[PDB]
C-alpha cells in the first residue's frame, strides 16, 4: 500500500512473501534522473498550487471584511450598554411587549 505514493519507478521493485526487491544500480541511476525531473515538473506544479492556494485565502479574507466589523462593533456596544440604567430597564421591560 505504501508504495502507492511517490513520483518513483513502480518497476524497479518487486514484492514477495517476505520482502520487497529493489534495484539500485542502473535502474537506480535512471530513477535519480527522473527524480530531478519531477522537482522540475513537480516544483513547478507545486508553486501554482501554493500560489493558488493563497489566492483563495484572499477571496475569503476579503469577504469576511465586513462580517467581522459587524461582529466587532456590535459587541463593543453591549459592553458599554449592559451597565446603563435605561438599557437594563428596556431589558426587564422588553418582554411585556408584543
Amino acid at each position: 500500500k505504501l508504495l502507492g505514493g511517490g513520483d518513483v519507478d513502480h518497476t524497479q521493485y518487486a514484492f514477495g512473501h517476505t520482502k520487497v526487491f529493489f534495484k539500485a544500480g542502473l535502474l537506480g541511476l535512471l530513477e535519480e534522473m527522473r527524480d530531478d525531473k519531477l522537482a522540475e515538473i513537480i516544483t513547478a506544479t507545486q508553486a501554482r498550487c501554493r500560489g493558488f492556494l493563497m489566492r483563495v485565502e484572499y477571496r475569503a479574507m476579503v469577504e469576511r471584511r465586513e462580517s467581522i466589523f459587524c461582529i466587532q462593533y456590535n459587541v463593543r456596544s453591549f459592553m458599554n450598554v449592559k451597565h446603563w440604567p435605561w438599557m437594563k430597564l428596556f431589558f426587564k421591560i422588553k418582554p411585556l411587549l408584543k
Partner: protein, 147 residues
C-alpha cells in the same frame, strides 16, 4: 519592462502590513506566486542563499530588490506545461479515466517533496472531489490552472 506593470508596486502595498514600502523575505515566495509566477520553494530558497541572503534572521525589503527577483523568476515560467501535469496523474491511477482515490492525492501532496500542509490539501480538493472518493484530475488540474 513597463510594458511597465506598475500594479506590481500596488500589490506590494497590499502585502506590506506596516505601510513602510518594504516586504520581508519570507513573504517574497508567496507574493511572486500572487503576481503570476510559480517558482518552487527550493528555488526561492536557493536564490536567496545564493545571494548570501539569510531568511533565518529578520528581513526587510525594498522594492528595488523585489522587482529584480520577480524578473529573475519570470524566465522560469516556461516550466509550467500542463501536458506533464495531467500525464503525471494519469500514470498515478489505473484504467482509462482520470480519477485519483481521495487519500492517495492527499498523502502525496503533503508528504512527497515540498510538504504542503493538510489544511492546504483539503482546500485544494474541496469541491472537485465528491463523496465517491474519486478526484477527477481532468477538471481538477483545469481548475488549479484557472487561478
Amino acid at each position: 519592462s513597463k510594458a511597465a506593470a506598475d500594479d506590481f508596486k500596488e500589490a506590494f502595498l497590499l502585502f506590506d502590513r506596516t505601510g513602510d514600502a518594504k516586504i520581508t523575505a519570507s513573504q517574497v515566495g508567496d507574493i511572486a506566486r500572487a503576481l503570476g509566477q510559480n517558482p518552487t520553494n527550493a528555488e526561492i530558497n536557493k536564490i536567496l542563499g545564493n545571494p548570501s541572503k539569510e531568511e533565518m534572521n529578520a528581513a526587510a525589503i525594498t522594492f528595488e530588490e523585489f522587482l529584480p527577483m520577480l524578473q529573475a523568476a519570470a524566465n522560469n515560467k516556461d516550466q509550467g506545461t500542463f501536458e506533464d501535469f495531467v500525464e503525471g496523474l494519469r500514470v498515478f491511477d489505473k484504467e482509462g479515466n482520470g480519477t485519483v482515490m481521495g487519500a492517495e492525492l492527499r498523502h502525496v501532496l503533503a508528504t512527497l517533496g515540498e510538504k504542503m500542509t493538510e489544511e492546504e490539501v483539503e482546500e485544494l480538493m474541496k469541491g472537485q472531489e465528491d463523496s465517491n472518493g474519486c478526484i477527477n484530475y481532468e477538471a481538477f488540474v483545469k481548475h488549479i490552472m484557472s487561478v
